[PDB]
């Protein structure tokens, strides 16, 4: 495995703020 | 139907590593967000595979690492330092997708995975 | 770091009762909770989402409420199939947590 773990991008809501 | 075909059942010695896998049938992976979850219930973290990022509880911070082949549209997770508290079944589940909504659910299930951790 | 709670922990009830389970957040989390219901061998299965809604396909006999710390879910008429372990769970901030689950049996 290697994706990044980035806790300051929330991969459950960022379409939602993305719009 | 998107549904989640999960690997085999594994047996794990104390301080080994464990790699579950989580493949898309039915459908692919697009825009959504899948993530792991053990059985209470607890969530170990997830991952965006379109833009391979993840996010993780701090619980398993620095144990647990995630990745995905939008090819063959299969989610990995790998758990490390497996203790014999490790020992449970591990669902791969998708996240609602946010662009409806940012309250979002766990909408597809995958049978689960039995992970042994035992000497 | 939100920690949810459930009650009673296990429900006695018979088919046809209407039944009221109680979730309760340690934080505010506005209306970002869902329920799930879980049979022995089976993964869970989303029943209510944002406190409310109800996902399709669910029976109408379910229904949520709440926003804030205190929700519920209600069956009015439990059917056979509903004798299950309930979880609620928010989606508010990581790490998202579970309750820790209300079982319902069958009265005899």
């Known amino acids: 495995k290697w994706a990044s773990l980035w806790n300051w991008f929330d991969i459950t809501k960022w379409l939602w703020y993305i719009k | 139907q998107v549904q989640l075909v999960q690997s085999g059942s594994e047996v794990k010695k104390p301080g080994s590593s464990v790699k579950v896998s989580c493949k898309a049938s039915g459908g692919t992976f697009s825009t959504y967000t899948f993530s792991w979850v053990r059985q209470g219930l607890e969530w170990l973290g997830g991952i965006l595979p379109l833009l391979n990022i993840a996010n993780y509880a701090q619980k398993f911070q620095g144990r647990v690492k995630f990745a995905a082949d939008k090819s063959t549209n299969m989610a990995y997770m790998e758990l490390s330092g497996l203790r014999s508290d490790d020992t449970a079944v591990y669902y791969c589940?998708?996240?609602?997708?946010?662009?409806?909504?940012?309250?979002?659910?766990?909408?597809?299930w995958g049978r689960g995975t039995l992970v042994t951790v035992s000497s | 770091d939100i920690q949810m709670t459930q009650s009673p922990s296990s429900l006695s009830a018979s088919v046809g009762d209407k039944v009221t389970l109680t979730c309760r957040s340690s934080?505010?989390?506005?209306?970002?909770l869902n329920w799930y219901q879980q049979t022995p061998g089976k993964a869970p299965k989303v029943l209510i989402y944002?406190?409310?809604s109800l996902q399709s396909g669910v029976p109408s006999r379910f229904s949520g409420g709440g926003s804030g710390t205190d929700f519920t879910l209600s069956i009015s008429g439990l059917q056979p199939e509903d004798f299950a372990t309930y979880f609620c769970?928010?989606?508010?901030?990581?790490?998202?947590?579970f309750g820790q689950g209300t079982m319902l049996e069958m009265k005899r």
């Open positions: 934080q505010s989390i506005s209306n970002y």
């Open positions: 944002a406190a409310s």
């Open positions: 589940a998708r996240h609602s997708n946010s662009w409806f909504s940012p309250k979002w659910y766990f909408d597809v």
């Open positions: 769970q928010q989606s508010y901030s990581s790490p998202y947590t």
